Amino acid sequence: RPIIAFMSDLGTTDDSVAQCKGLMYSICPDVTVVDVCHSMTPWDVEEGARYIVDLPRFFPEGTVFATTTYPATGTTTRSVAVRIKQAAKGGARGQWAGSGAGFERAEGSYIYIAPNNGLLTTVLEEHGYLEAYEVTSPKVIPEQPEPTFYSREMVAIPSAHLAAGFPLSEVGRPLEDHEIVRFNRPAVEQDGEALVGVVSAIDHPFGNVWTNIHRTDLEKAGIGYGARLRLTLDGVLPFEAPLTPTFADAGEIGNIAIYLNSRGYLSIARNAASLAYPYHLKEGMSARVEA
Amino acid sequence: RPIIAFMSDLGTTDDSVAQCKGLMYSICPDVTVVDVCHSMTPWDVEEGARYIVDLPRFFPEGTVFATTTYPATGTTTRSVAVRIKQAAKGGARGQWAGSGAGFERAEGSYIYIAPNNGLLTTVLEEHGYLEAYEVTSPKVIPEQPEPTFYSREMVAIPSAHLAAGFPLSEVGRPLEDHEIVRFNRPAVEQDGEALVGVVSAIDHPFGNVWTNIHRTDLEKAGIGYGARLRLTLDGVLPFEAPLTPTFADAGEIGNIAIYLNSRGYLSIARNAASLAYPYHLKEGMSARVEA
Amino acid sequence: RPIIAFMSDLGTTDDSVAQCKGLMYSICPDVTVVDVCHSMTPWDVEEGARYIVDLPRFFPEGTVFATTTYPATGTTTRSVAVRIKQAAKGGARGQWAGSGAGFERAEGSYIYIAPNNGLLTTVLEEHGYLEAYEVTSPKVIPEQPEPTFYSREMVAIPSAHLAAGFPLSEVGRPLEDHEIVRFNRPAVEQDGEALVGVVSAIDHPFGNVWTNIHRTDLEKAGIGYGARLRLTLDGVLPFEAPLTPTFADAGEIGNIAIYLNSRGYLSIARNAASLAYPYHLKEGMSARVEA
Amino acid sequence: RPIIAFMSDLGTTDDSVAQCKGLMYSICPDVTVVDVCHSMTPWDVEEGARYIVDLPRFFPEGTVFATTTYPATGTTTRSVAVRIKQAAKGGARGQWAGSGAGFERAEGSYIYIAPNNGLLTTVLEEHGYLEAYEVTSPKVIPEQPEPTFYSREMVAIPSAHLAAGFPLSEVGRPLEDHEIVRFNRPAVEQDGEALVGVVSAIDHPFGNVWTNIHRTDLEKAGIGYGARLRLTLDGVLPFEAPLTPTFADAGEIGNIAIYLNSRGYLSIARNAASLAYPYHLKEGMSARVEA
Amino acid sequence: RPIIAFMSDLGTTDDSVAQCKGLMYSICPDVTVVDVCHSMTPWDVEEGARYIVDLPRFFPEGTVFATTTYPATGTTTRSVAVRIKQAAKGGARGQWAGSGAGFERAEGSYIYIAPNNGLLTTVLEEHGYLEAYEVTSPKVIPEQPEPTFYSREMVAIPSAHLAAGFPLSEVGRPLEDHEIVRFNRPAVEQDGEALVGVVSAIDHPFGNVWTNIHRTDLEKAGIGYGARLRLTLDGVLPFEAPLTPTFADAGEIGNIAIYLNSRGYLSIARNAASLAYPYHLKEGMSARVEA
Amino acid sequence: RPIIAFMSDLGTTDDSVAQCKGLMYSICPDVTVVDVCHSMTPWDVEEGARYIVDLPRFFPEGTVFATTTYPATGTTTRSVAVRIKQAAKGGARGQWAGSGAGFERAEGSYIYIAPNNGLLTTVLEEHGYLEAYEVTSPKVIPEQPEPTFYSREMVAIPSAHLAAGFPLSEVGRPLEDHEIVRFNRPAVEQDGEALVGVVSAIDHPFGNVWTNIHRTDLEKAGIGYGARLRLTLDGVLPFEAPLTPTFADAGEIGNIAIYLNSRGYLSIARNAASLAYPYHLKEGMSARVEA
Numbered sequence A, B, C, D, E, F: 001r002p003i004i005a006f007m008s009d010l011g012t013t014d015d016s017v018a019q020c021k022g023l024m025y026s027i028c029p030d031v032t033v034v035d036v037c038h039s040m041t042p043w044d045v046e047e048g049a050r051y052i053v054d055l056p057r058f059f060p061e062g063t064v065f066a067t068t069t070y071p072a073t074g075t076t077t078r079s080v081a082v083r084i085k086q087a088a089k090g091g092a093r094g095q096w097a098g099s100g101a102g103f104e105r106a107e108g109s110y111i112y113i114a115p116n117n118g119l120l121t122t123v124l125e126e127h128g129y130l131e132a133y134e135v136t137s138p139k140v141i142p143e144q145p146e147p148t149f150y151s152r153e154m155v156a157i158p159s160a161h162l163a164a165g166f167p168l169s170e171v172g173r174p175l176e177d178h179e180i181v182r183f184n185r186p187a188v189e190q191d192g193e194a195l196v197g198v199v200s201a202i203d204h205p206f207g208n209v210w211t212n213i214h215r216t217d218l219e220k221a222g223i224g225y226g227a228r229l230r231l232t233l234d235g236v237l238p239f240e241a242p243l244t245p246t247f248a249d250a251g252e253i254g255n256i257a258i259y260l261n262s263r264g265y266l267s268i269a270r271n272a273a274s275l276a277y278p279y280h281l282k283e284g285m286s287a288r289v290e291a
């Protein structure tokens, strides 16, 4: 039972995704293709990264992540295929996913295949890796790749060979670390007792607000649950709430909750109401926090 | 081949759903996860109800409906898991789904697992139930549920245990009826020969308009096909048309059809054109019909 | 493990699709359903055709394409079921899809099932057909089809019987060619050295612009890679770029690329930026190319 | 203290209008300039005509109407200057305007000055004219008119000379009737008892709906106050109300009133609420009335 | 030199206003018509009131305010004409308007003429009045008023007779106080040290935010300039700033200023930036303040 | 008959402007107040400059230009009052405004009064100045200026004193040149034969596009009428057209005209259609022209 978990920016409006899916079933008859999502902001590798980094602990070992936004499509660049190290505990407290105590996932048990454009930055940082390869072998990519559709040609297709048991180290030469392109994570700065970060995303469809201010960033300025926090978005909209586990802790429908999202990050929202949408709060706006 | 049919408000923009799907495949290797939809109006239990109520007759016996919007996530609340009684004929005339005479579905053959927040109201109304359970066992929910992601923790995960043959009655104690939270259906009033109801939905992507005025509500005011109806949306926009089986019965492209939707309810549309969109007609307006 | 590739206009907002999916699994237990996409512009047969015509080469032989937009739902019209001839090479160069030299696909290896409203126009013209049939048998459609939901009753349901091995020629009587409804493809005109066509689509979610000016139309005005082209949308926005394989060939981010899309068509876009969205360029504007 | 009543499409966003105003005061020191409005849809002569045709009765005799939208600016075309015949009674009943029995206005008492593009169509047809002239004299237009600003140069400037007592017949040679450009008024058709017309305008800022169905058109289908009318916009929105003098006659706030607007035309609206705005009703939709 | 100051909801899109203006110059040849504004929210008497209440001290004595929104147009209701008592000091500090020490304005020196619908509520409250009259005399209103245009017929027209020296007390019988319709001012409540009020308007075109929390409301909870204030709009967006005279006091471009607007009311804004528009802050949203 | 020509960003939605106008009539009974416009982009000094610079040649000698956006309101800053030198020919060829040969305007005949924030930059550039003064005297500004309404207090009021014959040099001390705040004009660069500039404005309500590429900038690259120009907005949308006097020169409705606007600058539009609006072209984009 092989599984390819598919993430791209191909959208949900035409047959793009299906074409990849057609190819995946054609290469690996028994595959289950799990859509991650296909609707990220085109070419936004940083956004992409957020969608792919938290996956491994949820999927059965041997799962293959075909993760792609490919602005460099049709160029000589080639995909990188890495087998990640730890599945890594994640979440508001840092645990294994699943029922009971969660499902402990053995190391070396997932492979990502992605453009070598930085998409895998956070994956590599949070999970580490055992081995990394340039996807150049004509046994796993087309001999005449479609100039514009490298998401299909240099990702989908070879994700399928990988799902189908094609040995990882045969896709092309090993890549040294400096050859795996990285992007720079926007850093969280401890100026004063405060923590400056950014709204790193809007949590659709609810309009919850997500900052890049991680738990660890918080537990080092003191801040843990119960703590009365002042959170300031866009530099002008301040907000006050205690840090709480969840939304209903805010009290009435509409009230502000400051909480840690399911990825471990300081977030803000309204209890059973959208905070972002009425106020057009958006990704890229700054975000300060202090108790 | 166990099937989990998945309905949520998780959206289609991040890895939320896939996280759930990963866990599903991990708990129940053989599962086929069928998306119902994941783009309901967040926290709108009434809306969600409408997407899950008519499913059972279309799915193979033994299907599990993982259905969730969970405003109460992170609280002490626990999901309910019911096995429904009748699959229940549905539709504009009330029939079994499928080719020929349709496929009759044995009683007691589907289980719903949902927040105990009322999402299951109309399900229980239309289908009745054999047994209902508080989803509390550590064998089918996390010991450390992610505060904010109870859709994953108290729904996805346990739906997978259930698909996997985990005995329903072992998820937690039996729930008495009064403990199964219900919402109140907004009622249709026979004031005069008229029927006041409500636009209960816009039928996306077509812009057809659906009222909570069910057939039985109509065949007790007399009205059946052929009948010349006056329908009045928002209290201001009147409409005249015979009740007809379908859209093309309206005649020319753009003409008004008053008809009965595939769920059995009084609806209005334009023949091969959108009624709702040019006029900004919404889920929530007043609907009124007369002869 | 046969496969139904499903394309419709039913949207991703309600349980419509899943109802069809439910029936599919019910009729053909072992089916894998592949979503093509379900968010075509309602009733736009020409658009739908675009989404279905290039699929055969991608899917394993025996794949069944349930392709539907059905404004004539509820009428006496009956769907057509064709087995296509050639899987037909496609793309910017005209190749088999897949790794290596691609996967050659035997003829007579795919069935399309659709409303007889013209959706399969391009299919039939680019792939040809071996045999065509009116879908009338009670063995594959309901005895009381839901008047408004012929996508489900006259497509999904029977697509499932055909996936399940139901002999194609037993769905209903053979249709003669003139009975397969055709729409008229907007033609490309060689007025001068120029080539007048149309923006056939906006390529979502990137905002690339696609014309109905096919490569063949190009290679007979001389035009091939390297050529400096003037492309003029809407009649007033001219555009100058050499015809190149891909986006990055435009140079800096934002630069215009004139290139052939993955379907073989002349297209225009910006390198890692949206061309269509900032300027509200929309399908249907004139499009012209010349040396 | 003579008066130039000024109507144009120059907008209220730049100094365009004021430039004309500046010239007006410069040419006719004692002028009072009355803004009619300057935010007509650019180049829409039919709309402009609506704004200028009913003014004469309101202004003191000798008033000069500088009325302009000039797409032909910078060309050899020259404005027409007419002295109108009748000030012409107007309104829902047909009366002189003002207190008491209103202010009867002598004939031959107002001059219009406009592009010879058809703007004065309705003017000439409802008021008649005594004398018409091509505005060609260097005594009233520039010797080097600004190519793009013929509203200023071929209207405002000369309107000022005429306000200042410049003899009308010395602006340029007389024009014969056939040389005064006319546009064709969309006609109201008595098909049955019904009356087919058009939504001629949206009455901003209220959202009332105005048809080109004049009272006279009404009083010959029988229709006068008290009559129960069916009015049908866009072909599908029917509407039922008695024809009444005013809005409050509809009863409660929000209720539909069918009434005659202040220009004599059949109109529809909501009592102290907008009819057109919530439903995006727009000028140009069909409009029909009957008993 | 008589002046009529004109305020209505007639908009700036057609000849409505001009028709009134035509009539005004016709009744009172020497009048100067000063537009106040014509773009208030139709029928919003409370909004209207805010536009008319602060005027008297700016205009030369004898000025006449023609102030109208007239939902009751065409009914038997009649306008009220009042001569107000004091011109009343206004502003952030409460002073006479003008150069030097300002222009002291004698009592009994302004008349308002308005629908008797409550438009004059705040005028009457802030300025008091000497005498009040029903405008019924056929010497100052038409004998056949246009049903729909009472703004013109029962306001403009008789504002002009009043400007023209027609004795106030001749317009119709005196009205006792209980006959002058009043609306209820939304009250500011001292719950705790805090002051609950409302955003009473958005200050266009800047997007400054205006509350109904008057200076006096502030100087009674202590609050005066310098004071560190917490201001909470919509119940969720808190804000902190010192109360300062003006915008630049906020410091950097973009910073929040809490200040008293030119009408005396607690306001909030961004220094040289819009506060309302990016966040879609709107009239009707609550507004708390506390130091 | 003294004229105050008024330009501000006060908008047209409240009584702001009228407050100013009231004071104007109160200080200078005989004044005619001419609105320039009041809807400029708040605080956008560059924009405002463009609305006030070309006025003088259109107004009678002695006219006073009250021109204001005042971000610094409430601060110690004080307005500047200058008497300009030349009225300065303007336009697409450079002429006096008016009928015949136009009306020559004597030097030293207009005064501008404005915030000393740079609003007057291009005025002083194009017109030069004879004398400049700090507006400080209590005789022409309030002793207690309203902190927030310096447009009224330090502009409207004193413009009225000036219209009223109050000696310019008595408003406050003479200002040396370096004390008259200037902004920097964004410059046009002759890189190659090309001219890079900027869309300096959208010409509302037509959607014509105005560049800061002045005629003289063009007649030194050679370019005069007849010349075939390539113009490139936003760096992406190219355009080809002869330089022509006017719009109709483009030929058919909708065709592109490249021409020189009434202020002398290079502009682009569609003949009797909007260029800017369908394409969302904005004040601020890059403009580039070549041959």
Ligand SMILES: Nc1ncnc2c1ncn2[C@H]1C[C@H](O)[C@@H](CO)O1
Pocket (backbone or CB within 6 Å): A008, A009, A010, A042, A043, A068, A069, A070, A071, A072, A073, A148, A149, A150, A151, A152, C206, C208, C247, C248, C269, C270, C271, C272, C273
């Ligand atoms: N106009 C474009 N500029 C830059 N990159 C683009 C463009 N269009 C598509 N892409 C990329 C992203 C897809 O994942 C990928 C599919 O191979 O193609």
Ligand SMILES: Nc1ncnc2c1ncn2[C@H]1C[C@H](O)[C@@H](CO)O1
Pocket (backbone or CB within 6 Å): A206, A208, A247, A248, A269, A270, A271, A272, A273, A274, B009, B010, B043, B068, B069, B070, B071, B072, B073, B148, B149, B150, B151, B152
């Ligand atoms: N702002 C919110 N307030 C209250 N509850 C919220 C909020 N956002 C998401 N949720 C809930 C509902 C999801 O279905 C559910 C999935 O765990 O999470």
Ligand SMILES: Nc1ncnc2c1ncn2[C@H]1C[C@H](O)[C@@H](CO)O1
Pocket (backbone or CB within 6 Å): B206, B208, B247, B248, B269, B270, B271, B272, B273, B274, C008, C009, C010, C043, C068, C069, C070, C071, C072, C073, C148, C149, C150, C151, C152
């Ligand atoms: N308003 C309408 N007029 C005509 N046809 C409509 C309408 N809405 C849906 N449809 C059709 C097309 C879907 O594919 C189809 C699903 O069976 O339903």
Ligand SMILES: Nc1ncnc2c1ncn2[C@H]1C[C@H](O)[C@@H](CO)O1
Pocket (backbone or CB within 6 Å): D008, D009, D010, D043, D068, D069, D070, D071, D072, D073, D148, D149, D150, D151, D152, F206, F208, F247, F248, F269, F270, F271, F272, F273, F274
């Ligand atoms: N793009 C354009 N095409 C054709 N005509 C236009 C355009 N813009 C303005 N106008 C005209 C009409 C104004 O009344 C007039 C003012 O003289 O300028």
Ligand SMILES: Nc1ncnc2c1ncn2[C@H]1C[C@H](O)[C@@H](CO)O1
Pocket (backbone or CB within 6 Å): D206, D208, D247, D248, D269, D270, D271, D272, D273, E008, E009, E010, E042, E043, E068, E069, E070, E071, E072, E073, E148, E149, E150, E151, E152
């Ligand atoms: N549809 C309407 N419902 C209620 N009131 C309306 C409507 N249209 C106009 N008005 C009012 C307000 C104007 O000031 C006034 C002009 O006399 O007419």
Ligand SMILES: Nc1ncnc2c1ncn2[C@H]1C[C@H](O)[C@@H](CO)O1
Pocket (backbone or CB within 6 Å): E206, E208, E247, E248, E269, E270, E271, E272, E273, E274, F009, F010, F043, F068, F069, F070, F071, F072, F073, F148, F149, F150, F151, F152
């Ligand atoms: N938010 C603001 N920040 C800074 N200044 C502002 C603001 N709003 C108005 N103004 C100024 C500019 C007006 O022209 C001027 C009229 O007094 O008031």
Ligand code: MET
Pocket (backbone or CB within 6 Å): A203, A204, A261, A262, A263, B010, B014, B016, B148, B149
């Ligand atoms: C708490 S909402 C559950 C889905 C959400 N997007 C998340 O990952 O946390």
Ligand code: MET
Pocket (backbone or CB within 6 Å): A010, A014, A016, A148, A149, C203, C204, C208, C261, C262, C263
């Ligand atoms: C153009 S890159 C992404 C694939 C594209 N939507 C296609 O159909 O080719």
Ligand code: MET
Pocket (backbone or CB within 6 Å): D203, D204, D208, D261, D262, D263, E010, E014, E016, E148, E149
């Ligand atoms: C309809 S009430 C306001 C006047 C309206 N705009 C008219 O033209 O009559």
Ligand code: MET
Pocket (backbone or CB within 6 Å): E203, E204, E261, E262, E263, F010, F014, F016, F148, F149
């Ligand atoms: C401070 S902005 C000046 C105009 C504003 N609308 C007011 O009355 O205060």
Ligand SMILES: [Cl-]
Pocket (backbone or CB within 6 Å): A050, A200, A212
């Ligand atoms: Cl991040």
Ligand SMILES: [Cl-]
Pocket (backbone or CB within 6 Å): E050, E200, E212
């Ligand atoms: Cl108020």
